[PDB]
């Protein structure tokens, strides 16, 4: 239909208030990998802060 699926996320678990665990569901056949990998590669290197 040329219109994709958008997730109905289920949980933002905030254990220890500094180590969170987010779930997201559902995503298309391969969008899980691409979104996870893009977010991971951006957060690791290209995410400004101060140190």
């Amino acid at each position: 239909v040329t219109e994709f699926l958008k997730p109905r996320l289920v949980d933002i678990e905030q254990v220890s208030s500094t180590h969170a665990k987010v779930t997201l569901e559902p995503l298309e056949r391969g969008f899980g990998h691409t979104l996870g990998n893009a977010l991971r590669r951006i957060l690791l290197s290209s995410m400004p802060g101060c140190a």
């Binding site: 893009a38 977010l39 951006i42 290209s46 995410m47």
Partner: peptide
């Protein structure tokens, strides 16, 4: 997510 979307902004239509 915001940084990636504002990177993408140059190509999308809507």
């Amino acid at each position: 997510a915001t940084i990636l979307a504002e990177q993408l902004e140059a190509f999308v239509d809507l």
